[PDB]
């Protein structure tokens, strides 16, 4: 299996970007396998 990379752009902030999405505050735990899960 041949994995490869292609340049897709510069790393820059854009002034005219779409703005969206919430800002939830969540209790989570992170396990040894790198998996986040919710906690109560």
């Amino acid at each position: 299996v041949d994995m490869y990379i292609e340049r897709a752009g510069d790393i820059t902030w854009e002034k005219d970007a779409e703005v969206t999405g919430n800002s939830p505050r969540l209790d989570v735990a992170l396990d040894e396998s790198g998996d986040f899960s919710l906690v109560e």
Binding site: M3, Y4, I5, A8, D10
Partner: protein
Amino acid sequence: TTDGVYRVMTRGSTQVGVGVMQEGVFHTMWHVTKGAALRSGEGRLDPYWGDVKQDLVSYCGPWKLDAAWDGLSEVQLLAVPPGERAKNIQTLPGIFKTKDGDIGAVALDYPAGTSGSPILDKSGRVIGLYGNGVVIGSYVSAITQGKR
């Protein structure tokens, strides 16, 4: 080797993720490549450091990205979805509260091949990578940053 955001592709062809080239090191999420070698033109990029718990890997050198969310300001996800031009999505992160401290998290849900896309602060610095997260059903991605 040029600085920028890159698609991670596999062989038809398919985009399995995204990563960041900075200071001669390629940065992506472990789950995107599982540490496989990467072709870049005629060169080959070999893994240099990786950690399953952080879900991160660097190629050609040590992890270089060290900026962090400031906890108050909006950020931008520099999303590179499969089949689509790089695009900036601005958002106010929420928070993952953990026993070890708080982590910024973005409540944005893009295709899986977007994993590894950089999240930026207003100065253009990469404050982490997108694509390791939890479901609440909306996905929410940690802002996953390494150690320099």
